[PDB]
Amino acid sequence: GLDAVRKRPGMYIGDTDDGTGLHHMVFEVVDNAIDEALAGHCKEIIVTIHADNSVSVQDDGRGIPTGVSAAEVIMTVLDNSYKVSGGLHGVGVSVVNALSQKLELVIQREGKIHRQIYEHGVPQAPLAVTGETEKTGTMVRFWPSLETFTNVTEFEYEILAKRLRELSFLNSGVSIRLRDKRDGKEDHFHY
Amino acid sequence: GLDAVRKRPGMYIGDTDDGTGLHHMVFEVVDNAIDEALAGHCKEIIVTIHADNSVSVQDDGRGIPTGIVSAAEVIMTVLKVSGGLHGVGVSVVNALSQKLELVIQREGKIHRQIYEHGVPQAPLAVTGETEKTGTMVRFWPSLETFTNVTEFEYEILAKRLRELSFLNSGVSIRLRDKRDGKEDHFHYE
Ligand SMILES: CNc1cc(F)cc2c1[nH]c1nc(Oc3cnc(C)nc3)nc(N3C[C@H]4CCN[C@H]4C3)c12
Ligand SMILES: CNc1cc(F)cc2c1[nH]c1nc(Oc3cnc(C)nc3)nc(N3C[C@H]4CCN[C@H]4C3)c12
């Protein structure tokens, strides 16, 4: 289960001591958003570096189903990963969840906003309604585990910008915005 | 957990029913040869479509280390290339192969190990002497995993191998197709 992931994190996400695994965390989440974009439902993905050691990835696709919820299953249980050109394989978002000190899932779907929080891949409470909306999509925001990641524990604009540009080229037509609230930088990638 | 790979191959290798996964199996092995080229040791890679439902990939790099189980066995059995299949290793190919053969030329000896469904048939063994170095992986896809397209197709391999050679400039890749009597050579600098 996720216990195995927490025990041997580098095996599942990449080197935890040089920033490689840390940035893979973001790219794995981005891969899920691109997948939803390529399915024709998402027209815009937004990746944001926040000033609190989190990154969020937001799409305006269908929203993960919420009726535990299918969403919780997706987040917690350790599927074609080849729809996304340049996508990571052999990892799902549950690995990112396991290796996050906190992860926040916000889903806009069927008129409601739903939210669930996890810590180290363990939910705090059942998915709950937190608003109403006519919009749709999925937002994952996570704070990396500081037990897991060392030396490079903060997300770096240049690493994210370089890879997101590459992913936008490899998956032509997908629009990715990178917003960096910590550093006051922004980019739009779209080919 | 190779059983996990067999049970749910989609995350690891892709679609198993339309030939895309099947060909990813070849590209994963080729990625390992390209890695050895990027490391500055392999100059030439030979990809061969055999007439027995197998593909071999041979390089002329250092050869996977064989000391002790051997380091080679761990790579095959335990779960930087541009266009590489990121996050998967050759143990995934092994898991989803009916048979896989590893032949290593290293330190003056030829070493061989065979696997069935990712489980070794015997301990790595010496099978010859050589002045050459390199790694050869030859595999036969599992028909319990792959359906509909279960044979390797020249055009799919030719297209992607040309791309991989361009994306990883310097390495020479030969595609030999003994089943169909076709050959090509890809090399960019
Ligand atoms: C930051 N965004 C983000 C982040 C994220 F971690 C996951 C999703 C995610 N956006 C998503 N959108 C959908 O949309 C779907 C809705 N309904 C179905 C049947 N499939 C997909 N599904 C999602 N799922 C369900 C699985 C299908 C393929 N990938 C898995 C994750 C996501
Ligand atoms: C068809 N070819 C092929 C196929 C294949 F499946 C594996 C290799 C392979 N060729 C290889 N050559 C080396 O060479 C090395 C020797 N010594 C060291 C320290 N590193 C690499 N290592 C190999 N290894 C060891 C790991 C390093 C990165 N990739 C893993 C697989 C391969």
Side-chain angles (χ1 to χ4, degrees):
Chain A
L2 305 186
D3 212 296
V5 183
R6 295 181 220 105
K7 274 166 57 98
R8 285 169 180 84
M11 229 156 268
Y12 294 91
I13 203 57
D15 193 336
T16 62
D17 77 17
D18 70 355
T20 301
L22 182 73
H23 292 83
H24 291 166
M25 296 273 282
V26 179
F27 303 139
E28 167 56 24
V29 181
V30 174
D31 292 341
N32 285 268
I34 295 175
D35 209 8
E36 180 59 5
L38 292 171
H41 307 286
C42 153
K43 178 152 268 188
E44 182 53 48
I45 299 164
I46 307 165
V47 177
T48 303
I49 297 170
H50 297 275
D52 66 347
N53 197 203
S54 69
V55 158
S56 57
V57 180
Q58 187 156 15
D59 69 54
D60 55 1
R62 285 171 287 186
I64 306 173
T66 60
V68 303
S69 58
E72 183 177 332
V73 171
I74 291 297
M75 289 294 135
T76 57
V77 180
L78 184 65
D79 65 352
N80 181 4
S81 67
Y82 287 75
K83 284 154 182 176
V84 177
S85 294
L88 293 172
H89 305 114
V91 61
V93 68
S94 62
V95 166
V96 174
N97 196 17
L99 300 181
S100 292
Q101 195 80 42
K102 174 183 165 179
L103 183 150
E104 172 186 28
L105 175 63
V106 176
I107 292 159
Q108 299 170 133
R109 184 171 168 91
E110 291 165 14
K112 297 170 182 198
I113 307 166
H114 301 82
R115 182 169 182 266
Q116 190 167 37
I117 301 297
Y118 315 80
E119 291 192 353
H120 302 286
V122 181
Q124 288 192 336
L127 184 76
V129 167
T130 56
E132 313 81 29
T133 181
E134 39 270 305
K135 292 181 160 295
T136 61
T138 302
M139 192 288 300
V140 167
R141 179 167 175 169
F142 70 95
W143 295 253
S145 178
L146 304 178
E147 151 72 21
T148 299
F149 299 98
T150 57
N151 306 323
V152 180
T153 65
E154 294 182 85
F155 304 101
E156 296 177 358
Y157 185 81
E158 144 89 47
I159 293 167
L160 293 192
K162 176 175 180 178
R163 185 56 174 167
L164 294 170
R165 185 174 296 283
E166 287 165 352
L167 290 171
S168 77
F169 181 73
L170 291 162
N171 297 279
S172 272
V174 175
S175 182
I176 306 177
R177 289 198 181 271
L178 175 63
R179 297 178 179 164
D180 177 349
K181 305 291 177 72
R182 187 190 62 208
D183 310 319
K185 297 177 160 290
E186 191 168 353
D187 258 275
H188 180 210
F189 312 109
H190 176 32
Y191 295 97
Chain B
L2 298 195
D3 210 20
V5 178
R6 289 170 224 121
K7 276 165 52 52
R8 296 167 198 94
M11 194 191 334
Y12 303 95
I13 208 56
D15 192 314
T16 59
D17 75 14
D18 72 351
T20 59
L22 188 74
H23 293 83
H24 298 154
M25 296 273 281
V26 180
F27 307 134
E28 170 48 33
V29 183
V30 170
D31 292 343
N32 283 270
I34 294 177
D35 230 304
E36 186 61 0
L38 295 164
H41 300 290
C42 160
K43 212 77 157 190
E44 303 286 329
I45 304 170
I46 305 165
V47 180
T48 304
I49 298 171
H50 301 276
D52 66 343
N53 223 114
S54 74
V55 160
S56 59
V57 183
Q58 184 151 25
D59 71 49
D60 61 354
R62 284 168 292 184
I64 314 174
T66 63
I68 297 313
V69 300
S70 67
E73 189 180 325
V74 175
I75 302 271
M76 309 306 325
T77 61
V78 171
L79 200 68
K80 57 141 93 173
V81 175
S82 184
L85 304 189
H86 309 312
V88 290
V90 66
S91 60
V92 165
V93 177
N94 203 9
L96 270 13
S97 291
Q98 174 70 220
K99 183 182 166 175
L100 184 144
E101 173 187 31
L102 172 65
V103 174
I104 296 156
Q105 297 172 118
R106 182 174 171 86
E107 282 157 16
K109 300 292 202 193
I110 305 175
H111 286 96
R112 182 172 185 256
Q113 195 167 218
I114 298 302
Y115 313 83
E116 178 181 348
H117 299 294
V119 180
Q121 163 229 68
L124 183 80
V126 166
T127 55
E129 311 81 30
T130 182
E131 290 107 349
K132 296 192 197 167
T133 60
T135 303
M136 195 285 299
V137 169
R138 182 170 174 167
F139 73 98
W140 294 255
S142 174
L143 308 175
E144 302 170 341
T145 292
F146 300 96
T147 59
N148 309 322
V149 178
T150 61
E151 300 179 79
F152 308 100
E153 296 178 356
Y154 185 83
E155 180 53 75
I156 295 172
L157 294 186
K159 184 169 182 293
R160 186 55 176 171
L161 292 175
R162 181 176 294 284
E163 292 167 352
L164 286 169
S165 77
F166 163 63
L167 286 174
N168 304 277
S169 191
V171 71
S172 169
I173 304 180
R174 287 179 187 281
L175 178 57
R176 299 184 176 163
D177 178 351
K178 295 175 172 280
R179 186 188 63 210
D180 311 315
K182 294 180 80 82
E183 183 157 2
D184 211 344
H185 175 209
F186 315 111
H187 179 26
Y188 293 91
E189 281 295 347

